[PDB]
Amino acid sequence: DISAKDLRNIMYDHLPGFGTAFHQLVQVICKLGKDSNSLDIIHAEFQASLAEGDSPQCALIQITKRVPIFQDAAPPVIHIRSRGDIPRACQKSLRPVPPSPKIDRGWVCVFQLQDGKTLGLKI
Amino acid sequence: DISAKDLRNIMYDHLPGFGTAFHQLVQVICKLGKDSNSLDIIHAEFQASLAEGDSPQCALIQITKRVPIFQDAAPPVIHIRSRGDIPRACQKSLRPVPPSPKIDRGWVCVFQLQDGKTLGLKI
Amino acid sequence: DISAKDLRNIMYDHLPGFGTAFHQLVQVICKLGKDSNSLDIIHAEFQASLAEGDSPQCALIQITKRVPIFQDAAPPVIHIRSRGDIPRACQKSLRPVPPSPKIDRGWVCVFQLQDGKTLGLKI
Amino acid sequence: DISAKDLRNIMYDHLPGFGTAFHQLVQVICKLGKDSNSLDIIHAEFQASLAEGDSPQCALIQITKRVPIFQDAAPPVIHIRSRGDIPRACQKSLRPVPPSPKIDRGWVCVFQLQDGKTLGLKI
RNA sequence: CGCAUGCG
RNA sequence: CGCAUGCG
Ligand SMILES: [Cl-]
Ligand SMILES: [Cl-]
Ligand SMILES: [Cl-]
Ligand SMILES: [Cl-]
Ligand SMILES: [Cl-]
Ligand SMILES: [Cl-]
Ligand SMILES: [Cl-]
Ligand SMILES: [Cl-]
Ligand SMILES: [Cl-]
Ligand SMILES: [Cl-]
Ligand SMILES: [Mg+2]
Ligand SMILES: [Mg+2]
Ligand SMILES: [Mg+2]
Ligand SMILES: [Mg+2]
Ligand SMILES: [Mg+2]
Ligand SMILES: [Mg+2]
Ligand SMILES: [Mg+2]
Ligand SMILES: [Mg+2]
Ligand SMILES: [Mg+2]
């Protein structure tokens, strides 16, 4: 009904700036939504939040807390060659990964280096 | 089960400085938590946020964002005689109140003078 | 072609938050535009900036610098009964009025008290 | 007419601290001003902004926003051997560069390592 | 308290 | 450097 690329681009078009943690969260939300076939509920929920006057950022946090697939979900791993591969406005939002990070607690993704070292992206 | 005073003391124990906007947030949190019997789940949430690398200040903010009693809650009105009754480190964080302030958006409390004039505390 | 009220409301609908210095600047821009019959050039210039991807705030500053009526213009006086009459997100942007304040240098308006004391709103 | 070195010294004389992002901005300003013969109008704009109550830091920002040579100007690339060659008080203000940085948007300079890796300075 | 964006 | 908004 909507593709993960169309949704991503729709959400990107509502976000201030570029390569922010919320941008990374768009990618995470759309990849988990595609793999669990929930892109349409994510889409509808997004556009309802906007219609009620929430910020797109609020709308994305609301998604992580309301849509079943993100509830209790662990952040997905993203492979990187170096910290230079991390989006350009996330660098100050990185921390060691805790034992049980959750998307509904602001853990967007786990960046993983070639040596297996990990960095948690945190909202 | 922890009492309101014990939770306040643990939280004050983690905070930097004296009479800050976050010391004021501790009192608001402990009072609402006591009235909804949420003191324990607030304590669990404080210590869970610290464990994943939140500052104490941020961890108090996480309480307002995740503990159900703080969802959409209006800040308490605190009656004062003069501006000097507000802790000095809170002064920089005062501003006129919005139409419908909410604790989970940063509005800690509303100071109110005898002639009904107000000063909002916003982190 | 467009009324000062319709334009104001259009510009207000693009501005983040409420009662900010840029909100006051909308009122100033639309009152000087009405009195000099330049509301339509102000309107067209505003919507061209947005179409090119400028922020509404950028668009308003661009207006003060490009539209003849604001060039070398002094801030208009606004009468107030007290500092409480100043929009609720301008309080930290007030200063003594200089001898020659200009709109194209970020002097939005001059607030004047009943005793004749003045406060400059500065961007 | 003031020389580049004299203008730098006047500006350093107004600034707090040592090796800050604003000391770096002074050097960029003085170098571009010297190359476009804008040193005098930069000096006039610095002293005009101070006179109307701008901090020295803000007054340097006003130069980039009002003096024509800084309009849409790209930050200079400064070649370095290591990160330690960047003044220590500038480190907090480093970030990855955007596609098309502009001085009048806050991009003071771009530090460049021997292998071509970059660090932007953003106030 | 901090990050992001916008603006000076 | 600061203000504004958003978010934690
Ligand atoms: Cl980009
Ligand atoms: Cl990957
Ligand atoms: Cl880090
Ligand atoms: Cl403080
Ligand atoms: Cl106190
Ligand atoms: Cl309002
Ligand atoms: Cl009036
Ligand atoms: Cl003041
Ligand atoms: Cl500094
Ligand atoms: Cl240095
Ligand atoms: Mg964007
Ligand atoms: Mg202490
Ligand atoms: Mg507000
Ligand atoms: Mg109200
Ligand atoms: Mg608004
Ligand atoms: Mg100094
Ligand atoms: Mg940028
Ligand atoms: Mg580039
Ligand atoms: Mg913003």
Contact criterion met (CB below 8 Å) for D76 and D31 = yes
Nearest one of D21, D120, D26 to D75, comparing CA atoms: D120
CA-to-CA distance for B98 and B38, rounded, in angstroms?
27
**Domain match, C107 and C87 both:** yes
Our measurement of the distance from residue A122's CA atom to the centroid of its chain's CA atoms, rounded to an integer in Å, reads: 10
Tell how far the Cα of B25 is from the centroid of ligand 4, in angstroms: 12
CA-to-CA distance for D24 and D120, rounded, in angstroms?
12
Segments in B15-71 forming alpha helices (H): 21-35, 39-51, 56-66
Contact criterion met (CB below 8 Å) for B11 and B60 = yes
Phi, psi of C111 (to 5 degrees): -80, 135
CA-to-CA distance for A113 and A76, rounded, in angstroms?
14
**Domain match, C24 and C84 both:** no
**Domain match, C88 and C105 both:** yes
Can you read off the two tokens belonging to residue A77?
Answer: 């791993």
SS (HEC) of chain C: CCCHHHHHHHHHCCCCCCCEHHHHHHHHHHHHHHHCCCHHHHHHHHHHHHHCCCCHHHHHHHHHHHCHHHCCCCCCEEECCCHHHCCCECHHHEECCCCCCCHHHCEEEEEECCCCCEEEEEC
CATH number of the domain to which A91 belongs: 2.10.10.70
Can you read off the two tokens belonging to residue C82?
Answer: 């007290």
| Per-chain residues with Cβ under 5 A from ion ligand 14 | B 97, 99
Given D71, D87, D115, the domain boundary residue is D71
Distance C106 CA to F3 C1' (A): 12
| Integer CA distances (angstroms), D51 to C97, D44, D46, D48, in order | 11, 11, 9, 5
Q: Are strands D77-79 and D107-112 parallel, antiparallel or unpaired?
A: parallel
Tell how far the Cα of B68 is from the centroid of ligand 11, in angstroms: 32
How buried is residue C116: exposed, middle or buried, by Cβ count under 10 Å (0-12/13-18/19+)?
Answer: exposed
CA-to-CA distance for B34 and B29, rounded, in angstroms?
8
Look-up: residue for tokens 């988990």? A32
List all residues 6 or more positions away from C45 whose beta carbon is below 8 Å from its beta carbon. C59, C62, C63, C66, C67
Chain B meets chain D (3+ C-beta pairs below 8 A): no
Can you read off the two tokens belonging to residue D96?
Answer: 């990855």
**Domain match, B76 and B52 both:** no
Number of structural domains found in chain A: 2
DSSP string computed for B57-121:
HHHHHHHHHHSGGGTTPPPPEEE-SSGGGS-GGGGGGEEPPPSS--GGGTEEEEEE-TTS-EEEE
CATH number of the domain to which C67 belongs: 1.10.8.950
Nearest one of A122, A61, A66 to A92, comparing CA atoms: A122
Cα torsion angle, C111, C114, C118, C119, sign = negative
For residue D88, give the H/E element and its range.
Answer: none
Distance C16 CA to F6 C1' (A): 9
Phi, psi of C95 (to 5 degrees): -150, 165
List all residues 6 or more positions away from A115 whose beta carbon is below 8 Å from its beta carbon. none
**Domain match, B23 and B64 both:** yes
**Domain match, A80 and A114 both:** yes
Tell how far the Cα of A94 is from the centroid of ligand 3, in angstroms: 5
List all residues 6 or more positions away from C2 whose beta carbon is below 8 Å from its beta carbon. C39, C40, C43
Experimental determination technique: X-ray
Can you read off the two tokens belonging to residue D52?
Answer: 């109307």
Q: Find the domain containing B84 and state its range.
A: 72-123
Can you read off the two tokens belonging to residue B38?
Answer: 């949420």
Can you read off the two tokens belonging to residue C86?
Answer: 């100043």
Residue A14: helix, strand or coil by DSSP?
coil
What single-letter DSSP state applies at residue D70?
A: G
What single-letter DSSP state applies at residue A93?
A: G
Residue numbers in C near D52 (CB within 8 A): 95, 98, 101, 105, 122
How buried is residue B90: exposed, middle or buried, by Cβ count under 10 Å (0-12/13-18/19+)?
Answer: buried
List all residues 6 or more positions away from A18 whose beta carbon is below 8 Å from its beta carbon. A87, A88, A89, D98
Distance from CA of A11 to the nearest CA of D (A): 20
**Domain match, C11 and C59 both:** yes
Distance from CA of C3 to the nearest CA of D (A): 31
Resolution of the experimental model, in Å, one decimal: 2.4
**Domain match, A77 and A48 both:** no
Nearest one of A85, B105, C4, C58 to A94, comparing CA atoms: A85
**Domain match, A4 and A53 both:** yes
Amino acid symbol at A100:
S
Given A71, A90, A110, the domain boundary residue is A71
CA-to-CA distance for B107 and B73, rounded, in angstroms?
9
Residue numbers in A near D97 (CB within 8 A): 88
Given A71, A88, A109, the domain boundary residue is A71
Contact criterion met (CB below 8 Å) for B121 and B111 = yes
Nearest one of A43, A59, A57, A54 to A8, comparing CA atoms: A43
Which residues are within 7 Å of strand F by their Cβ atom? A 54-55, 57-58, 61, 106, 123; B 55, 57-58, 61-62, 65, 95, 104-106, 123; C 16-18, 20-22, 89, 91-93; D 22, 55, 57-58, 61, 106, 123
Contact criterion met (CB below 8 Å) for D7 and D39 = yes
Look-up: residue for tokens 């903010």? B61
**Domain match, B91 and B34 both:** no
Contact criterion met (CB below 8 Å) for C114 and C81 = yes
CA-to-CA distance for D90 and C44, rounded, in angstroms?
41
Contact criterion met (CB below 8 Å) for D39 and D8 = no
Torsion of CA C87, C27, A57, B73, to 10 degrees: 30
Nearest one of A92, A13, A21 to A56, comparing CA atoms: A13
**Domain match, A13 and A58 both:** yes
Tell how far the Cα of A29 is from the centroid of ligand 3, in angstroms: 23
Residue numbers in D near A90 (CB within 8 A): none
**Domain match, D62 and D4 both:** yes
| Integer CA distances (angstroms), B29 to B68, B69, B88, in order | 12, 9, 20
Nearest one of B116, B115, B111 to B27, comparing CA atoms: B111
Distance from CA of D46 to the nearest CA of A (A): 30
Look-up: residue for tokens 């901005």? D25
CA-to-CA distance for A14 and A32, rounded, in angstroms?
20
